[PDB]
């Protein structure tokens, strides 16, 4: 997918500046193409075309800068993410099971936002939901100012006569009226309108954050550039998919200095701590890489290439035990490791 | 004493929510009874009744939540409090020796107040002064917006003709007039009216914070939900009592994310840094616990129980060296340790 | 708590008469003090002050006289109660789960009531509800003439539009109106007024017994001195509390010759037979009693003392296996057994 970014936002993230001519090489390191370059009052913007439809991590400035940092060797190996527990619980209603069953959550603290970072976070929310999340049905992402809500938080099946003021409206309306009148209600309502109850995200004093996957509230938990601590919700139909999307969101914010805090998410039959950023694992024989690539790279050379692709690599007796970031879920087969070696060979 | 709390407030502090039926059991963990339950503007409130006359720590939502966290194992062992030095000094005037001799002080920074947290702070201030403080005579507490005052601060014997606007009045009045005309002047005036001078708390530029133990300024250092940083003064007749009360106020505010800062307190003959939250210490024979309890609990079992009661426990030769929070001053004899063991045995 | 009793009534319960001088000693056996003595058209009354806030069994003439019989050796050991099944079911509506979740029930048959026995039963109802039941919130007790109701009985969540004539009123009112206009509605209504439904106790003909915990009906199941068979309900938030109160009520009535009949109480997820007067159990090392009392009472002497305190005592090799009446719930630690030994040593 395509997305816009600010040249100065990328450069603060990578930590270095580059000419436009150098940027031509840089974008390919992030598996994208430079679709356009323009200025708006002296400020340079790129439209990037992300060539990897299976890597949501690559669809924002944060993910692009991260790749480039590894390509340039400013960092190497597995990116490290510390997650500390918040004191927050979110309850997921079992009555949502056949309506919109899964919610996962995170808090990211200590952010200093501005026009560029806020707009990237919003565009990323939309790009994940459109493509990876199939126009929000599979993955819908909400973001909220954590300082403005009162935990515990409830993701619940609500009566259609419940009320709140949806974004862009100063007065409360029933959930029914929102589906009917709000533009996002018309656009997305079919996902829920025929169910007995609608999903509602609501805090401990009855303030409605949002109605997933339709619209956020006008007055509760609004994110501005003054927002320091963000509360993120991701809902959908498969737990693995909402967790991937959450992982992408929180690691993008970690690139802006955010401190990721886990929350306890309570379902009827189980509880889970999200996000879970435990590195994922894969094993490959290094001679598979040599034989199928047509390249004569020794074990050390292959190790070095995979470290530029954000892998941890432990070789014993010609076989590589790998770890890779929890923000990826595209790795399935040995040929996927081979592809990343071939890519890194270009760096 | 009895005090009111908000259910949602308690739940945000503990981190999870409970049914009213469960809240029946939980209040017992905080040594409280549920005196009443009602709703107001759709919010649920509790009136809690604390039997323990000499545990002011237990008389607010903060202390109640803390006790319940420990009883549920959300935390264990000694709660730890960081105190850093502020750059503030307070001068305590020797001429107050036989009028209202002791003042102790703290700064608590980084607060985010709302209607629940602000009302708990005020209520605790009142409850401490009423019961523990013997209607203010022994312990009186002031709280001020610190951003709005200019250090150093002076707690001094002032002429009766000195002037300020007391709470509720737009116009200044002499100290003498305040005692006559202000409701708290009539209620508490007898504590000081027969002395040559009245206590006054005043900053570097002659702004009167208050006249202890009577009333605060209408216009100087008022506390609102916008207040982030608080200056606390506690005055009375015994240093140990006022320090205890101060420790309770600051540790309650630490539960709200407050950062506690010490103050240099200068008397004619000595100086003290307050608050001092050094844990207090006690030792007991574990055989004493077994014999008097009638419970054959082994040393590991007694240690688990004491950690639920907020003690640090080091055992050697079946003797327990204990640390406990400086917000308590009720522990005097081995039987007080035993009581806590019997209590925890019911969790 | 304080409560009034008739001197002649106490004495028919004990089975013999005493001078006022002798009564001065007797009241202490029941853990009471004489707060007042007076005569009212020919009859002598006492006001008794029960120190034991934890022992509702001691708050009526039946319970006082019982402890006095035991102190005098008229009875010894465990009081025994026979419970036989009635053919009666009471249904407790799961929709009251978060309104007033528990009801328990009993029938006592073969009573010969009079003004003293009737007013004792009524005051005990009040005394238990006030002190033990926290002004009705935790325990509320109703009494009905079982011959005037048609079982099965339903304790249910009722629409606020349902109607009956509350005690002291000849006209039927809606539940809403009762809470609004009845003395007891104003006083206790806050306990239920914010819920979607109100608790109602109703028979199979739709006659309303009561609206717990507010008021009984003027016309349905009224108890008089002609009443022979009593239906008792106890409602609250904790099953063990309401069971304890039920047990106090029925055992008090057994002192008057009442024959206790259990009721099948049907909840959505379980059923219980009430009352359950199975004796409660405790074990203590007799060395403990010697150690803490400082007395060198031998095992048999301690057994004698405990039998005057209504315990069954079985000793094997220095360890006492105790049973005590199910009308008590105050015993939690070994020191509670000790306390009873010390009391009995006073007799």
Tab-separated table of C-alpha atoms in Angstrom, chain B residues 2 19-22 24-25 33-40 47 49 290-295 338-339 342-343 345-346, chain C residues 54 97-98 101-102 134-135 137-138 190-191 193-195 237-239 241 283-285 287-288 291-292 332-335:
chain	number	residue	atom	x	y	z
B	2	UNK	CA	-16.519	6.529	58.824
B	19	UNK	CA	-19.212	-7.081	42.234
B	20	UNK	CA	-20.975	-5.539	45.247
B	21	UNK	CA	-21.291	-9.103	46.583
B	22	UNK	CA	-17.484	-9.413	46.341
B	24	UNK	CA	-18.621	-7.372	51.021
B	25	UNK	CA	-15.550	-9.521	51.561
B	33	UNK	CA	-17.089	-2.537	57.374
B	34	UNK	CA	-19.394	-1.518	54.536
B	35	UNK	CA	-21.596	0.920	56.346
B	36	UNK	CA	-23.656	1.989	53.360
B	37	UNK	CA	-23.954	1.717	49.577
B	38	UNK	CA	-25.738	4.204	47.424
B	39	UNK	CA	-25.655	5.696	43.958
B	40	UNK	CA	-25.509	9.354	42.957
B	47	UNK	CA	-19.514	4.631	53.290
B	49	UNK	CA	-16.443	2.298	58.778
B	290	UNK	CA	3.026	-20.081	67.187
B	291	UNK	CA	2.437	-20.321	70.948
B	292	UNK	CA	0.130	-17.340	71.336
B	293	UNK	CA	-1.784	-17.944	68.083
B	294	UNK	CA	-2.390	-21.664	68.749
B	295	UNK	CA	-1.614	-22.125	65.088
B	338	UNK	CA	0.648	-11.541	66.420
B	339	UNK	CA	-2.566	-9.593	65.688
B	342	UNK	CA	-4.190	-13.647	62.949
B	343	UNK	CA	-5.690	-11.060	60.625
B	345	UNK	CA	-4.617	-15.870	58.390
B	346	UNK	CA	-8.237	-14.814	57.311
C	54	UNK	CA	-20.761	-10.481	67.611
C	97	UNK	CA	-28.262	-11.527	41.913
C	98	UNK	CA	-27.124	-7.916	41.814
C	101	UNK	CA	-29.093	-11.950	46.034
C	102	UNK	CA	-29.792	-14.324	48.936
C	134	UNK	CA	-25.929	-3.106	59.284
C	135	UNK	CA	-29.322	-1.306	59.292
C	137	UNK	CA	-28.503	-3.819	54.178
C	138	UNK	CA	-26.745	-7.069	55.096
C	190	UNK	CA	-31.830	3.844	48.664
C	191	UNK	CA	-30.739	0.192	49.022
C	193	UNK	CA	-34.223	2.368	44.294
C	194	UNK	CA	-31.587	2.589	41.554
C	195	UNK	CA	-32.108	-0.941	40.285
C	237	UNK	CA	-25.699	-10.198	50.407
C	238	UNK	CA	-23.861	-13.114	52.040
C	239	UNK	CA	-25.278	-16.611	52.436
C	241	UNK	CA	-24.729	-14.109	57.309
C	283	UNK	CA	-10.172	-28.209	67.695
C	284	UNK	CA	-7.798	-26.860	70.348
C	285	UNK	CA	-4.841	-28.184	72.302
C	287	UNK	CA	-2.111	-26.926	76.738
C	288	UNK	CA	-3.043	-23.703	74.896
C	291	UNK	CA	-0.580	-21.474	78.729
C	292	UNK	CA	-2.650	-18.364	77.891
C	332	UNK	CA	-12.454	-17.871	64.519
C	333	UNK	CA	-9.291	-18.395	66.625
C	334	UNK	CA	-8.043	-20.486	69.562
C	335	UNK	CA	-8.207	-17.365	71.727
